[PDB]
Amino acid sequence: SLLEFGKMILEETGKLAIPSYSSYGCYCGWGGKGTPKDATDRCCFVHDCCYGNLPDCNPKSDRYKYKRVNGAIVCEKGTSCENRICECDKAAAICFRQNLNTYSKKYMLYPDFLCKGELKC
Ligand SMILES: COc1ccc2c(c1)c(CC(=O)O)c(C)n2C(=O)c1ccc(Cl)cc1
Ligand SMILES: CS(=O)(=O)Nc1ccc([N+](=O)[O-])cc1Oc1ccccc1
């Protein structure tokens, strides 16, 4: 669920999920169409794609638990929907962490019309 994810994001990047990530590029937060504008945008894209493989789960409201083994994010045994979700968020977390150095503000609050193009997961 978002609470977990957001907290995971803050620990990892030091930036707050909302609003640093709720309206970035074409895929962070609003999902939908387009060509990811950048690495972070791709992270979000691969992430939306991750929730896409769990049709009958509820990434948003289902809560899972995770811990840190020295800085490592470690998803704890829960329902199977819970485990698979958590893996999906961990990746996004890492991913964001891996491209902080190219996180660009001109993609904050990006207008929808500039998000057209095709991309299959
Ligand atoms: C590729 O992108 C997707 C696809 C489906 C999604 C989401 C993101 C998010 C993610 C979001 O809002 O960031 C949620 C919550 N999805 C569903 O609940 C869902 C539920 C029931 C059926 Cl039968 C099919 C899909
Ligand atoms: C899930 S939605 O319809 O895509 N809204 C939404 C998108 C991103 C985030 N977030 O924390 O990164 C949080 C989000 O929603 C909330 C807004 C305020 C308080 C709690 C959740």
Side-chain angles (χ1 to χ4, degrees):
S1 93
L2 270 45
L3 282 10
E4 284 77 50
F5 189 28
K7 169 163 171 292
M8 192 172 265
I9 295 312
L10 174 52
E11 305 177 332
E12 215 69 19
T13 81
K15 248 111 146 58
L16 286 134
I18 296 154
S20 300
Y21 292 110
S22 44
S23 76
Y24 190 101
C26 295
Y27 288 80
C28 298
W30 219 59
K33 344 183 161 191
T35 278
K37 314 267 69 195
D38 77 338
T40 293
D41 205 11
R42 275 186 288 278
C43 295
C44 288
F45 175 71
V46 170
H47 189 252
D48 277 342
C49 286
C50 206
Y51 286 174
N53 292 315
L54 316 178
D56 315 303
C57 288
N58 300 282
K60 279 154 121 155
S61 39
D62 203 341
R63 298 215 263 217
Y64 54 77
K65 343 219 79 194
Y66 72 91
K67 60 179 176 177
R68 294 257 185 193
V69 158
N70 269 349
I73 290 175
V74 170
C75 298
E76 274 151 348
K77 180 158 221 303
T79 63
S80 75
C81 264
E82 268 149 35
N83 304 323
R84 299 159 80 206
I85 284 173
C86 182
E87 283 304 320
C88 258
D89 288 355
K90 179 192 174 189
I94 282 288
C95 201
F96 295 139
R97 180 53 183 94
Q98 205 177 186
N99 299 283
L100 262 180
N101 273 1
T102 44
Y103 173 111
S104 165
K105 281 173 162 181
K106 72 177 184 295
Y107 293 118
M108 236 160 80
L109 295 164
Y110 212 71
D112 174 291
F113 79 117
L114 290 185
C115 289
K116 27 101 155 65
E118 226 290 79
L119 239 214
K120 252 162 162 138
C121 294

